[PDB]
Amino acid sequence: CRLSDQEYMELVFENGQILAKGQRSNHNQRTKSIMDLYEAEYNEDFMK
Amino acid sequence: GGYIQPFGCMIAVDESSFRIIGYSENAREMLGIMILAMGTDVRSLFTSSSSILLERAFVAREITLLNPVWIHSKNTGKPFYAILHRIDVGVVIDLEPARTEDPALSIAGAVQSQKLAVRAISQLQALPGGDIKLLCDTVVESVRDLTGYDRVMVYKFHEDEHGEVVAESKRDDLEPYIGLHYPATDIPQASRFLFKQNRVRMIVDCNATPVLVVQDDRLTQSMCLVGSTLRAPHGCHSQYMANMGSIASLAMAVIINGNSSMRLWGLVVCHHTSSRCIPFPLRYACEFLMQAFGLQLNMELQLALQMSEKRVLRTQTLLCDMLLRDSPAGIVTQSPSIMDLVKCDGAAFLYHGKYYPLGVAPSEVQIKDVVEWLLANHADSTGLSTDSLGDAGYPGAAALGDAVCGMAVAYITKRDFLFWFRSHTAKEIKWGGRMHPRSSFQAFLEVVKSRSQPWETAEMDAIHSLQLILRDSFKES
Amino acid sequence: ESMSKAIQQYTVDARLHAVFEQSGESGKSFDYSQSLKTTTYGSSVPEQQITAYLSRIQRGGYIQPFGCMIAVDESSFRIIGYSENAREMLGIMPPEILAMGTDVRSLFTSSSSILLERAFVAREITLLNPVWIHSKNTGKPFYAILHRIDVGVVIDLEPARTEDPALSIAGAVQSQKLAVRAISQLQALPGGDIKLLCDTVVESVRDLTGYDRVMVYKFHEDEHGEVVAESKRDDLEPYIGLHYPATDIPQASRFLFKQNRVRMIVDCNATPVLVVQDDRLTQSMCLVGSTLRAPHGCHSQYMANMGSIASLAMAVIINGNSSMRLWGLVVCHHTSSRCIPFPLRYACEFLMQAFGLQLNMELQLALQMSEKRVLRTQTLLCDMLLRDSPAGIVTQSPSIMDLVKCDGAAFLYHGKYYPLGVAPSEVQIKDVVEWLLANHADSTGLSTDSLGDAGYPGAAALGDAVCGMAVAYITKRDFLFWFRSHTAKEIKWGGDGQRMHPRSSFQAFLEVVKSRSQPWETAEMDAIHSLQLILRDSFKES
Ligand SMILES: *[C@@H](C)[C@H]1/C(=C/c2[nH]c(/C=C3N=C(/C=C4/NC(=O)C(C=C)=C4C)C(C)=C\3CCC(=O)O)c(CCC(=O)O)c2C)NC(=O)[C@@H]1C
């Protein structure tokens, strides 16, 4: 039950069938809450 | 005038001339001033662009749809998220400081609130629409992921306004509050109305010293801070939260459609262990998710009602078909019985002296005693239903104990009867775990002692239709 | 993967695309009607044509000229492909600053580069998407949307309005609050009607964006489309009630619409922009997720011919039985160039999600109500059979016609013929019985959508009055008949098929459904089978 991000997929025609092969077959899953991600990424420290 | 939590400001002005009529006691120190005094112009306290935005918000009819406003301070230049509403006296603005002063990151956050809400709702709509427990668990999981609190639960208000925790997700170091019930008195009606109006209520610190709002000496009465999001909680609730252990909270509102006017189905309450403030985009993402939650809950409720109607109709048809074959005494002798029409712990049929029990039913002596009592008081009626045998008129209810607390009777002619019994509301409640949830529990039990769950309208009409079938069949012979 | 309409339609889409390209290259005109009539719904196409068609649709290397595209390698921030107009847009032109193999962090400002780096090294979800950046030379504010392909990161850069950032935040909060109000108004609606829901949604959408025309397309089981609501601009010609063939929206395009929720076309007459790539890369870039992908020439020509210059299409997705299904689209059309900002698209997506949820509501509730009504009608018919002779079930009301939506009913009891509504004559039904017993003898039923395609030699003289016939085998001599008329009777719209215009689409659709009734749903056959079982048991008791 993770939020994740929209992953796009492309139709290919193989073995006499139309299969929606994914782009990147994918470790290091997220282990921190979205609150921690917001507090880390939105860090305006390099503007000193 | 009231009180406010010390994480924001409060300024009330006249709508026509932007004329100050009352300010919070911390406004002249958080806005960087020291000018405020009493009775000054707010446009002079902000930058030109912020003043233009404020005037544009003021002029528009619906003061909503223009909230929040990213105004800027004038003496320090720090940003300030401002929320506006109308108090019939004037316009009230609440300023909550923004901790992202970058003009580039703020826009990214303002769009990411919408993106996060869309992603969470898209996750919500993947589940099949056939149950409510899965919906509640998914909602609490998503809310815990977005907010990162220490505990998230869902409260459900019953027909007598008492609550029951139906879903929960916690950091597994604390006791689990799933399956607990509390009486209706724990939530005042005014608080329910306020939750119906402003479908968000966030308390940052329960031990924070409230700040008095300074009023003006030209207007009667105290201004209504009901619509404000900075209103300080009552002392009783602060004591309750301090005793429970939680220090911060964020209660949303689940609102469904009913008989049209809306109905407060329940809340979604998040609890922490230390002061948590949370940033604005996550708050708005949760607020946007609650709407889809309410829509799906209404869907599930209506579908469940239709399914229950269909099931009751099928059961009644099967019962009537079994009745028509041979003697009418075959109703109870076969596997499909009366106990399937209604949610009951026992059933009984009194037909020509001979008595047929099923499940948790009293003995024959108590049965004829009940018949005598019924024929004493209610003789000309057609049916009766008491959620408690005692307190209703039965003198012998003490002998029954906590097994026949609830009862519903239907007379056939004047002497043959159909009874549906029900035990007290303590055999289906577990909660395996000074104001404290332990005190509220089992005080709910003393409130509901020697009483069964009330009979719903659908069951009453099902019983009425079946009874009419008995009258028709027995009139045929 | 064979009987489904989509797989059969893929080959027809490939054939039509090839025909369009051949006509275009040879200096001719794409004849819509002749091309649609010539190719059938079957499949006689090899693997190479389908593969090439899919590659051309998904990997075309052409974007719309309202934003730039830059692709980089995740390893060392190195450009591996870009659009030409980027040099125009970023202001790089007067040692090359935009040459392949450069550092993409030297094109923007230092803070923008740092934000890009933070958004680059990430995880399953990142919290800077899109980013608000500034070009190095001029200072143009750019909205950068990043997504991932099999070889690197694709960045779509769209220009933004240069103004006070407070106005930038306001333009998003107001657009989101409008959608919130629309959803709230959608909530407080008397349930049980779909038409009112659609008519509210179209008005809310038109008030939100502000286009010159908004319509809702619903897809049937045949996979064709129908306009179910419309909010025009007074002097514009109405399109409500229009029906267009299934081939107008290819299956691959439907998949793409389901992938990216909101797809916008700014100008249908602008010149598409080429994308330059690397020599080492095997195949062309994948523009399957880029918000700048240019429409194929066929749709651009269609939009130019019919009158629209801009477009904004959104997807209506319901839950099918986990699994998502495309119920239809909500499409806004304009009469000039129109490029709405980014937050409006997200607000529209939110509104579409709410609309889909309420649609699932109404569909499931309607199905339950239909089941209840069918049960009540069947019980009443059984009571009527018990109280009187079997012929009673056709004499008074409610009768067998009330069981399913049809135009006529017929009962054949030992030579006696009981017709209700529109129905064939005596000799006509006798010949129908003869053919039915000759062809399908060992069967308990037969449901056909067209008596012509089924094999009945008498369908031609039968006429358009009855076209579909559902049969129930009560005995070897007694049957139950339900008759339904052709689809064109309820098809009514207030409106040389060379050009590609909605009138030609309507003509093609009317040609497609010639001598064909509406599909027989499964629930109708279930009810017919239940009635057949009850009648069979009752008559076997006698
Ligand atoms: C004292 C005056 C009475 C009182 C007042 C009061 N309560 C609320 C809000 C809530 N009361 C909750 C109580 C409980 N008890 C539980 O068993 C439990 C959870 C399992 C909780 C948290 C409750 C569910 C709420 C709403 C959620 C929350 O805010 O935490 C309020 C409103 C406070 C405000 O919003 O400003 C008042 C005034 N409650 C009592 O129990 C006393 C008899």
Ligand SMILES: *[C@@H](C)[C@H]1/C(=C/c2[nH]c(/C=C3N=C(/C=C4/NC(=O)C(C=C)=C4C)C(C)=C\3CCC(=O)O)c(CCC(=O)O)c2C)NC(=O)[C@@H]1C
């Ligand atoms: C040429 C290759 C074939 C073709 C391709 C094609 N169509 C679309 C998208 C749409 N086709 C629509 C058609 C019609 N016809 C109508 O009757 C009508 C309105 C009353 C319209 C607009 C249609 C509804 C769409 C969806 C988008 C929209 O509403 O404009 C596409 C996808 C384009 C994209 O990527 O956005 C392609 C490639 N269509 C034909 O008619 C040719 C046979």
